């Protein structure tokens, strides 16, 4: 699932789209019905403009991929973007907004899991609003790692333990394991770790009932 922001003269509308194959005309149609309540075309027709290119009408038959953008201006054909009140600079940038809206979305990361503070194993870390899965990636000279699934309701904390350089960072994942709290350490580049830590923290501020007991103990 993908998200675009539609800026109008009287506010913004966040629109969910299936994929980038969706036509800009369909996106227009959804925005107008949301802004005005009804799908009624009405006396004024409306146009979509890329946020980066003012006063220019988007090809409505073009795909959303054709536009290399996720923010668009909804403007009546008779008027201009400058006649409205919105299209503001206090609003959060679109990439951060899409990141917040996609927290529960499943995403996998290739990171290294640290064991006994002296060893590493390459794991691919699948995270979603449902669960966090830790799986190996590609036998007489190798035992694979036991696959581990942690239900999201068992998660207590996911913090950045250390950041040394853009290629090295460590984060700690705490969770409830049979009335006891286990801690998992992972290592990757700073950008990857920052995304993981932020993604889980979005999920944690969505659920409860075990983190609070952990924080009470702290």
């Amino acid at each position: 699932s993908l998200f675009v922001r539609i800026n109008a003269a009287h506010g913004f509308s966040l629109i969910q789209v299936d994929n980038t194959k969706v036509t800009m005309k369909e996106i227009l149609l959804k925005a107008v019905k949301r802004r005005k309540g009804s799908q009624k075309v009405s006396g004024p027709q409306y146009r979509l403009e890329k946020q980066s290119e003012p006063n220019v009408a988007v090809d409505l038959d073009s795909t959303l991929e054709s536009q290399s953008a996720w923010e668009f201006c909804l403007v009546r054909e008779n008027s201009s973007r400058a006649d409205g009140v919105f299209e503001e600079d206090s609003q959060i940038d679109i990439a951060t907004v899409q990141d917040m809206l996609s927290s529960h979305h499943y995403k996998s990361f290739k990171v290294s899991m640290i064991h006994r503070l002296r060893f590493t194993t390459d794991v691919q870390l699948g995270i979603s609003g449902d669960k966090v899965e830790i799986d190996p990636v590609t036998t007489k000279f190798w035992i694979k790692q036991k696959p581990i699934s942690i239900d999201s309701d068992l998660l207590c904390a996911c913090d950045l333990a250390e950041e040394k350089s853009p290629s090295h960072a460590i984060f700690k994942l705490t969770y409830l394991s049979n009335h006891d709290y286990k801690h998992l350490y992972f290592e990757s580049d700073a950008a990857t770790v920052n995304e993981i830590v932020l993604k889980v923290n979005y999920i944690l501020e969505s659920r409860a009932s075990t983190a609070r007991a952990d924080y009470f103990a702290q």
């Binding site: 998200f3 506010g11 509308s13 969505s206």
Partner: protein, 167 residues
């Protein structure tokens, strides 16, 4: 020109988007298109003062709960909406006020309790119970119907008044 920033919160499907559009476009949206986030400006005269209403229509779905921390700091008043036919949407009001008073770090935040869908004959939430909740939290309680437009204007205007008393 005083600007009041209003935020409509509540569980999914209770009619947050329908009430907001009823205020803005003055018609009833029968479709249930789940909200991510939407903002609307309306100019209105309340108690002799012309006011610019900045209305924020938020998501009832928990997948988009990460947006709640941003819109709860900036908002001045909050329209806490439940549906009279959805008992838990009433029970979920406790979570929404607690988060609002937590993010705002205050005990006295302009708020109005709204029981929507009062046109339906399938009421499951007591008006005594809902009135008792609002009294316990010290906020006005309004019943509304986005279908019949009952008390739609009163619900939003009362919140503006609650914001105005606060200052």
């Amino acid at each position: 020109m005083t600007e009041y920033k209003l935020v409509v919160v509540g569980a999914g499907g209770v009619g947050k988007s329908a009430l907001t559009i009823q205020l803005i476009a003055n018609h009833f949206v029968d479709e249930y298109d789940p909200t991510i986030e939407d903002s609307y400006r309306k100019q209105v005269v309340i108690d002799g003062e012309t006011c610019l209403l900045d209305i924020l229509d938020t998501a009832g779905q928990e997948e988009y709960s990460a947006m709640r921390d941003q819109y709860m700091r900036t908002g001045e008043g909050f329209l806490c909406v439940f549906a009279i036919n959805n008992t838990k949407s009433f029970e979920d009001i406790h979570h929404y006020r607690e988060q609002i008073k937590r993010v705002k770090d205050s005990e006295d935040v302009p708020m109005v309790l709204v029981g929507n869908k009062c046109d339906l004959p399938s009421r499951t939430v007591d008006t005594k119970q809902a009135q008792d909740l609002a009294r316990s939290y010290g906020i006005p309680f309004i019943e509304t119907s986005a279908k019949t437009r009952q008390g739609v204007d009163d619900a939003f205007y009362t919140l503006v008044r609650e914001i105005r008393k606060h200052k």
